[PDB]
Amino acid sequence: ANFVVCEGETIALSTSTVASSYNWTGPNGFTSNLQNPAVIQPATTADAGSYTLFIVDANGCQSADTSVVVGVNRGPAAPVLTNNSA
Amino acid sequence: TAFNNGPVCRGDAVQLNTTTINNALYEWYSDAALTNLISTQQNPTVANITTDSTFYLVVTVNGCPSSAVATTVTLHPTPATPNIPANFVVCEGETIALSTSTVASSYNWTGPNGFTSNLQNPAVIQPATTADAGSYTLFIVDANGCQSADTSVVVGVNRGPAAPVLTNNSAICDGDTLLLSTTASADTFRWISPNGIDTITTVNSLMIVPTNGTYYQSGDWTLITQVANNCPSEPSAPSSVV
Asked: Which residues of B are less than 8 Å from A28 in CB distance?
């Protein structure tokens, strides 16, 4: 299902079905032919977008193009602190 | 009888075909008048079919030529120009992301610094620099093998200025006005307070009144500026106010 990760966290995708081959495409040129594509370890803002998949079955036929949208959240800059000293 | 290949791309060739007859003479003509002979092969190929056209076959057997048989070669409907982002500008150090919103058998992107891609969503140029500025072009090959019009986006690159030099009034008594200043000629001179307060002026000077409890502080101050653009300078080395 559509999901959101925070910048610096990972984006892991997977297909639960069986196929002769898998074909994934997405943002930043993400490309994979696996059931379980390499995980994007340092996920960043540029990795946000639509990740799509198609399946080629045992019989050579190519299934419908399906997808997940992956959002990316960002944290703020570190704050400046003060205190009362002594 | 005579047959053609299926619809053909505008610059491609079409193999024409007919029935094998023992010891027959085949003649293919470019026109109904049968005055311009193209070939005498059973299965000739005609190059550069840029428009719908017809060919005429005459077969002679036993010295007796047939009537002419026409075939029509259809041309496959030309694919639409691809959808590309509007011209845009990024600042050096920001990224350049390109994408095509259309569907294709293949994509072919080209550009500055040898940028090359065959994806709908090419790898993003992460440290974009001045050398990445220029025209990024695309072409699309459809399901039918035809190659669409070459379209493009121009990507500009902005640059930020060098960090400014700062001075201050050193040791300041409680009643002494604090004047922070620089040597830089710039727009949007943003002075950053030790508390984290970002204040913006149009001149190379910030006057802090002794009664101003949020800016009349002491510590390490820095400055970020812009010059006729939206790109910030490298921040100045912090300077200590006493």
From this structure: 121, 123-124
Cβ <8 Å between A29 and B126? no
Distance CA B56, CA A34 (A): 52
B121 and A27: CB-CB below 8 Å? yes
DSSP B136-186: EEEEEE-TTS-B---EEEEEEEE-PPPPPPEE--SS--TTSPEEEEES---
Burial category of B223 from C-beta neighbours within 10 Å (exposed 0-12, middle 13-18, buried 19 and up): buried
Q: Is A27 on the interface with B (CB under 8 A)?
A: yes
Interface A–B counts its CB contacts (< 8 A) at: 26
- Experiment used for this model: cryo-EM
- Of all residues in chain A, the one with the smallest CA distance to B118 is A29
Whether residue B121 and residue A25 make contact (CB cut-off 8 A), yes or no, is yes
Cα–Cα distance measured from residue B10 to residue B4, given in angstroms and rounded to the nearest whole number: 15
Are B28 and B57 within 8 A, CB to CB?
Answer: yes
Chain-centre distance of CA B230, in angstroms? 23
Task: Give the C-alpha separation, B186 to B85, whole Å.
Answer: 32
A11 DSSP assignment: B
Residues of A in contact with B123 (CB under 8 A): 28-29
Q: Closest to A80 (Cβ–Cβ): which among B97, B126, B196?
A: B196
Encoding tokens for residue B62? 């036993």
Task: Tell whether B195 lies on the interface with A, counting CB pairs under 8 A.
Answer: yes
- Indicate the SS3 state at residue A12: coil
Q: Is B202 left (phi over 0), alpha (psi -120 to 50) or beta?
A: alpha
- Quoted resolution (Å): 3.6
Residue A52 Cα distances to A26, A38, A55, A62, B75, angstroms: 6, 15, 11, 14, 33
